[PDB]
Write a protein that binds this ligand. Structure first.
Ligand SMILES: NC(=O)CC[C@H](N)C(=O)O
Ligand SMILES: NC(=O)CC[C@H](N)C(=O)O
Ligand SMILES: NC(=O)CC[C@H](N)C(=O)O
Ligand SMILES: NC(=O)CC[C@H](N)C(=O)O
Ligand SMILES: NC(=O)CC[C@H](N)C(=O)O
Ligand SMILES: NC(=O)CC[C@H](N)C(=O)O
Ligand SMILES: NC(=O)CC[C@H](N)C(=O)O
Ligand SMILES: NC(=O)CC[C@H](N)C(=O)O
Ligand SMILES: [Mg+2]
Ligand SMILES: [Mg+2]
Ligand SMILES: [Mg+2]
Ligand SMILES: [Mg+2]
Lengths: 150, 150, 150, 150, 150, 150, 150, 150
């Protein structure tokens, strides 16, 4: 990757629906070269794909919760709990963090009831789980994970 | 929105690079009707846009940190700190949560040094900030915020 | 329920001993219509009943304690502990909360000894119980759960 | 108060809509004596009144939150914050507890938005307030504050 | 007990080596009446005895530690741990407290090594013990448990 | 101090009302030598005095509380708060501990009201005080500070 | 050890590569006496040896972590965990502390991956380990353990 | 640096008092080449020096404490506190850590009194300091910071 690829990615991270023309004109390079560079980035794994950005509100995903989960120590309990958490419907993020030394889980549901049935109740029945603390997000000030180039 | 729009969105959330043909054939509806429905979803704000999914690793974004921030109480301190946090380079997520009653900030940097210079040092100089706790993500088990329809 | 029912409920939540006359005169509606509306609210479950408000102090209920209880995770431990807590004499409130991710128990006793014998000792013998923290209420600034319409 | 008054109160705490007949027949005492005893209990302050029990769900009071509040120390800050908390619309309970050495606030709202506007935002602007932690009640296992005689 | 007994106790709590004369002259009552009152207080259990106040420093009791101990819940674990703690050499105080909902243990030792051998190591081997936190007293600002009448 | 003084102190710490005869007979030494040794211990400061042990229960000292107090840092705030705490009526113990890095205060009162008026309210008005946590002692398993020789 | 030995040690703790001449001239004593004193300090165990001070940065030891570890109570679990921790590659410090009543572990690794593989993963599989909290050192303000004489 | 330098450093980190002969014979390289390599490592900053390892016990450094320090946020308070901490006599380590988001300070003193006078009292008077928690090390299981090559 070179400076030019970065200029291309900086654009595609915001809007992937531009025409090779506009981009080429902005970056000041041959459209055939652009198309090539973009195809190379996809083959190399830099660009893993293209998604439609759906407004979670439009889907009534009003009950957002960030949950910290502590796993009991011993015989692979930690690694197994991570994958169990990632398969729960509504869970889009699972991170293991150093400090708290536990899992941070990001999930979205339409209501409290759905959250309890699909996430909370399920997580509570997991024996490996030592403890949890579910944080209710009452305000999304920002959420743009797509922006990787600042 | 109807059941059909959901089938369309469920596809576009994963791959927006399909052809109206394939989708139409899968959903079993006229391509002209599909194109219409999709254009309507965009005009209605359900589909806010289309992004390229860039692999953060490809950009050496190795230092990932989830930081909790406590703001001092009183005269609009809380709301102001939120926007200050969202403008920091490298910060893609800022949420205010109930329970901890503080801000949860998601950020990505190439190294510890960048993180300290762009995020930590800056956050420390903010007077409104009462306290913080930065969690180092040492493992991303899952991160698919684009998946809103399960 | 309409605006008129709300005016009726706003009154009955404070004093259910009024006469259909006074209320009718205040709300400015036929006494026969009032009686009907009230009977409908009872049949519909809005008005679950009428209670006498007894001053807890008059019963020497001097030892008030708000206890948080953490249940161990796994095989229905959580749901079972909740009902065990609600059957304890002196316990009038049991809530499961998100954040602390534990039960909050409200209880009233005449003395420390009664509290220990009827609540504390009993709760300690429950194996499902992971941990507890009992908060001693030394001052009731307000307690009007009957006021649901502000 | 004697054993007989307790039998009367034990009944009235559950249902104040009984007839002096039924109660008299159950307690086995003259209806004129009952009426007298009840009037005495009201004059003495044991029975502070009679309320209609309204099902909070019937009023869409779905967002229930138990909040702990820490007040800064010094010049009457503690006592003043207590009364400020009790005047907030939607707040039915305010207790000062020993141990946590802070205020426990019980509130009910129809939605997250109402809660934020009427409670959270208001509490955040109070300078005396050091810190808070709002617990989201996702399940009411029991709530019968009217039962003072077990 | 009357006002006079209190005046007697207020004196004896500070210095039990006074003569019945001095005390009688100070309290302004017959020495024979004093002797009687004091003998009555002993027979009644108010005065449980008379001790020599030994300066702990004179015995090289330099390592003072206040330890909080959490016992696991279930089958009489709590009550049993309390008595086990009270029999440890060097432990002069054991209290069960509400709030922390654990035992507070006061102990004194000549050195760190003695403390580790007689207290810490022993406490660690107790299975019922969930967790502990030992606070090192580096300054005794006051310690007059003998003063019960202020 | 020698082995013999220790045998004397071990006795006097439990009961200072023995006769020089009994003690001399038990220790197997001349009564004149005993009297001398004891007088020397008093002059040397080992024996600071003799107190009457009054049963706190006999004085209705039912509300026992162990309070941890955190002082703000800076200009002699710590040392000043310690002496302010030790002068509070009902407070018999004040220790500064390493770990929690705060003051531990032992106090006794007849009732909750007295505790609030004499201790809590007073402590809350102290500006230097950062935070506190008052632990309610609901059970004294042991309290023998007089026993310094085991 | 005398004042002169201290002057010698104060020098050798900083730089052990000086010549007996320079030191002798600085301390103002016969070189033969110096050599003797130094040999005595080594034989007596004061000087346990001489090491080369290697700059950790020069070895790419960029991932520094201070981890607190809580061991479960009971049958020698504590002492055994300590030695298990000290044998982990990359761990240079293991301390058992009073207060937190847990182990503090100092370790150094080249990267996050090495840290996870050699330390974290290994520690997680230890059953005796109750919980841990790994603190990421992002700045070494000072690290001179060799300086024992100030 | 190459594999050979590492073999040299691995030796010098343990014992810098070996002769170029022994080392050369062990590493199997010309003594003149060794001397050169070692001189290069010193000029390059890998080997910052050579110290005498003094047994802290030999200096009566019995009071070891690991203290966590929280600095108030705002105008360079954090960076300034770090250097203030590093200049305190007896302090050999100061680290700023991510997670706890505070300073970890390692210090050694002969007694509690010295610790209080040189460290604690001084740290308490620092206004920038928000809070601290000093952990008493009662057992050094391992302390070999000199070992950088495992
Ligand atoms: N930007 C453009 O469209 C130029 C294209 C270029 N001439 C080519 O060879 O494709
Ligand atoms: N799926 C298709 O391509 C059919 C298209 C449809 N016949 C139209 O009117 O556009
Ligand atoms: N408020 C009243 O009492 C009026 C009653 C009304 N006239 C009826 O039909 O009952
Ligand atoms: N229970 C009753 O109704 C009896 C009443 C009773 N005879 C009276 O004097 O009122
Ligand atoms: N205070 C005194 O010694 C008076 C004693 C009193 N006269 C008696 O009867 O013993
Ligand atoms: N124990 C005794 O009373 C002996 C006393 C001893 N003969 C003396 O000289 O006082
Ligand atoms: N400082 C010196 O080198 C003097 C040495 C001294 N004359 C001896 O006997 O070794
Ligand atoms: N290891 C040795 O001492 C050999 C030294 C080597 N011959 C030189 O040139 O110095
Ligand atoms: Mg996307
Ligand atoms: Mg009621
Ligand atoms: Mg005494
Ligand atoms: Mg060294």
């Amino acid at each position: 990757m070179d400076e030019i690829d970065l200029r291309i990615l900086k654009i595609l991270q915001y809007n992937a629906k531009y025409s090779l023309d506009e981009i080429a004109r902005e970056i000041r390079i041959p459209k055939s070269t652009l198309s090539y560079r973009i195809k190379k980035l996809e083959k190399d794994g830099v660009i893993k794909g293209y998604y439609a950005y759906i407004n979670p509100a439009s889907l009534n995903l009003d009950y957002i919760v960030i949950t910290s989960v502590k796993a009991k120590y011993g015989k692979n309990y930690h690694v197994e709990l991570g994958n169990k958490l990632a398969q729960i419907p509504g869970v889009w993020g699972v991170y293991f963090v150093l400090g708290d030394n536990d899992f941070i889980v990001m999930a979205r549901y339409k209501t409290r009831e759905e959250f309890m049935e699909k996430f909370l109740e399920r997580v509570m029945s997991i024996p490996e789980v030592e403890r949890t603390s579910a944080q209710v997000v009452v305000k999304i000030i920002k959420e743009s994970p797509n922006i990787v180039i600042f």
